[PDB]
Each structure stands twice: as C-alpha cells, then as structure tokens.
Write a protein that holds these residues in place. Structure first.
Motif, PDB file in Angstrom:
ATOM      1  N   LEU A   6       0.826  -1.212   0.000  1.00  0.00           N
ATOM      2  CA  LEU A   6       0.000   0.000   0.000  1.00  0.00           C
ATOM      3  C   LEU A   6       0.861   1.263   0.000  1.00  0.00           C
ATOM      4  O   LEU A   6       0.609   2.216  -0.746  1.00  0.00           O
ATOM      5  N   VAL A   7       1.860   1.268   0.871  1.00  0.00           N
ATOM      6  CA  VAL A   7       2.826   2.364   0.955  1.00  0.00           C
ATOM      7  C   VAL A   7       3.559   2.518  -0.373  1.00  0.00           C
ATOM      8  O   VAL A   7       3.838   3.634  -0.805  1.00  0.00           O
ATOM      9  N   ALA A   8       3.834   1.392  -1.022  1.00  0.00           N
ATOM     10  CA  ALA A   8       4.557   1.361  -2.297  1.00  0.00           C
ATOM     11  C   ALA A   8       3.739   1.814  -3.500  1.00  0.00           C
ATOM     12  O   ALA A   8       4.297   2.033  -4.579  1.00  0.00           O
ATOM     13  N   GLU A   9       2.428   1.949  -3.329  1.00  0.00           N
ATOM     14  CA  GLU A   9       1.557   2.283  -4.433  1.00  0.00           C
ATOM     15  C   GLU A   9       1.988   3.616  -5.032  1.00  0.00           C
ATOM     16  O   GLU A   9       2.162   4.601  -4.299  1.00  0.00           O
TER      17      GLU A   9
HETATM   18 CA   LIG Z   1       3.418   5.334  -2.169  1.00  0.00          CA
END
Ligand SMILES: [Ca+2]
Lengths: 225, 224
Positions: free
Chosen positions: B8-11
């Motif tokens: 999610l953070v990597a989105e």
């Molecule tokens: Ca992100």
C-alpha cells in the motif's frame, strides 16, 4: 474422501490414440494432420465428459456450449500435460504419439510445445496427483470466462462448488502445505496462456489450407478466435 | 499484515494521459495518447517493483524477465482498479476516461470489452485496494517467464505474496473462506487480456501510423 473428486475420477474418459498413417511418410503436414484429427476426436470426448461434472448439465444449453467453446483447448492441453508428467522434455499427445524437441521443431510447434512443457515442469515440481488434475480440468471449464454467459450466478456457483472440492481435497490429503490449493489455482493463468497460443497457432494453419481439419475442430476454433 | 502494508505504501502516484488539446480528436490521437501513457506507466512500474519484498533480491536477469512478462498485466490491473466505481467506462487515467463510442473509434472495442469483463468481476467481489495491490504483486511474481534462472527464489516470492493474500483474507473476510482462491481465479482473465493488448499494440507498431516511445516498444518486442 471428497464426493465430487471421486465422481470426476470415475468420469475420467478412456485413452484415445493418435493413430498416424504408416503409409504416409513423416512430414510437418502428417504431424499437424495427425494432431488435428486427434484433437477433433478428443473434443467429442470432452463434450461428453463435461456432462458428468456435477451441476454442469443443469446449466442452460447455451451456457454449457459457451463454457465448452471457451475452455476446450485448456482441457485438451491439460490432458496432454498430465500424460507427460513421468517423461522428460517430451509431450505425450497420445500413447502412440509422443513428440520430442526435434519432432516439435519439424511440425512448427517448438514455441507452443515449449510452453506446454513449461506447464509440465511446474506440475512435476508439485507432484500433481490425478485427483488434482481432474478437478483442475473441471475448474478450468467452470472458470473459462466466456463473454456470452446468461446465468452468471449459476456459473459462479459451479466455480465455488468445484473450488470447494479442491480445497477439501488439499485440506485432507495435503496438510503439510496449507497453500497447495492456491498453488494449483496459480497454474491456471499459464494454462490459459498456452491454450490461446495453441488456438491462434492452429487457426493460422487453417488459413494456410495445407492441412485437412474436421468439422468440429474447425467449429471450436472459429468460436474462440 | 506487514506485506500488504508495505505494498500500500509502495503504491505509486497517479499519472495523467495529458492529451494534446491542439490536436483534434481522432483514432490516432487516442492511440498515441495511450502509448505515451503506457510508456510513462512502465517507468513507474519498474520503479514500483523494487519495493515488493524479495523482488530486488533476485538476480537482475530474473527481475527483468518477470517485468518483461508481467508489465501489461500490471498496467491493465491499474486501469481496471481505477474503473471500479464507473459504469461501462475505462479510467486509463483521471483525465482519460473512455466509453464504448471512444473505444470503437480507437479500434479498441474488443480489447476494452475484455478489460470491462475484468472490471465487472471485481465489482461483484467488491475488490479492496489491499487485494488489488497484492494481486498486482502476485501477477508479477507468477508471470511465467521462459527465461528464469533461479526458479526456487521466484517460487519463494510467489509463496510469500500468496501467503500475504491468504492471511489478509483469513483476517478481513472470514465470511468467505474461499475469497483468496476466488481472487487467484481472476488471474487467467488478466493474463488473457494482457496478451490481447500486447498483440493489439504490436499490430499498431507494424502499421507505423502511431509514434511510440523506445521503452514501450522494447517491452512489446520482449513479449511478442
Ligand atoms: Ca506510495
């Protein structure tokens, strides 16, 4: 023991033979003719076999045909794949028609057959069992993603039923791996990929007009392309 | 779930099609716009892949092999997710939404109908962003490249992502014990439509009417 898996085992069709013509010399066209004649005859057997899949014949005739017209090549290829598990770099299209790399090259099928062998390679790692093969064959049909489906809920219910059967099988016979059912489902994309390559390949051969093909096989090719 | 959270953070950030207002609305403008968008999507995907746990531990060779196989699936899955709250429309970007008539015009009716077939299925299931991002990662790991060297490491990456999905569904969706499997069973259609898109945009390359950037063309050659 799961009731649906057991039925599917009993429903498993009889062995079919390619029966190539000995009077006709080995060529690229003999092979493709042989394979297309074999596929034609497999098809008849698959269409009959689908009727034994619990819930399938309860669908409308339209929906039954839609799923078969989408999934037939997957089912065909999955059969080839299962027959080839105890072999090395060879594809058992039938017991009397095993093709190695050289023969695949001759027939113009290296790319297709290498992809089928990719599929074999994966199932050999997992030690695929016959119970799992037949269930995956039924799931492939139910999960065929035809655009022409009328009763979507009935088809999804069939997917769930067959999926549950696989989950129940793996929960009971393969406790050592809680994710095996998922692992099996994750092979279905490649199955689909290689079905599509085979359909497009054999459709190009139809257009080239050098290979005679029977009515049913040509009918099921038109539907997919 | 730690993996889902990391994903999610990597989105990535939202990207814009930015069609040319000076250029009039044609079949060629649309395709040019979409190919430009795809090109820029790819850069983003390649960067994004590095944040999938385990991925950059693979050999550079294998990293590239998975990306070369899965990029269009990941691209399409993004389009699909953006389109969930819409009806019969494909949000390729927030400034580039195409309906049936626009698809027809661009020569993409068959491709776009297949994408909408994917949307239709995820709407039934009420796909969550947690599931989307995980499936995106699974699609990459499960890309089935011919050219993989370290097979075991790739399988391990599949297992780790698969396990994350399974844990997510076990915790969030106890009402459906087969939700994870249902999600996995959407992957063949994703693959099917990926391949259609690749073959479709390759034919456009051969027709030579549409300008395409170097990276996009490079990733099309690899797959075809
Ligand atoms: Ca992100």
């Amino acid at each position: 023991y799961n009731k649906i898996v057991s039925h599917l085992l009993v429903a498993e069709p009889e062995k079919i033979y390619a029966m190539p013509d000995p009077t006709v010399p080995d060529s690229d066209i003999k092979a493709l003719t042989t394979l297309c004649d074999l596929a034609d005859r497999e098809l008849v057997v698959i269409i009959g076999w689908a009727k034994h899949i619990p819930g399938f014949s309860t669908l409308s005739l339209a929906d039954q045909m839609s799923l078969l017209q989408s999934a037939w090549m997957e089912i065909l290829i999955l059969g080839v794949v299962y027959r080839s598990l105890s072999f090395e770099d060879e594809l058992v299209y039938a017991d009397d028609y095993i093709m190695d790399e050289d023969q695949s090259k001759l027939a113009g099928l290296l790319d297709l057959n290498n992809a089928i062998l990719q599929l074999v390679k994966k199932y050999k790692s997992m030690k695929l069992e016959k119970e799992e093969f037949v269930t995956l064959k039924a799931i492939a049909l139910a999960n065929s993603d035809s655009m022409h489906i009328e009763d979507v809920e009935a088809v999804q219910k069939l997917q769930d039923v067959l999926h549950e059967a696989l989950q129940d099988y793996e929960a009971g016979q393969h406790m050592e791996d809680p994710r095996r059912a998922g692992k099996m489902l994750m092979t279905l994309p490649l199955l689909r990929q290689t079905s599509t390559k085979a359909v497009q390949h054999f459709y190009n051969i139809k257009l080239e007009g050098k290979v005679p093909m029977h009515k049913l096989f040509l009918e099921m090719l038109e539907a997919k392309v």
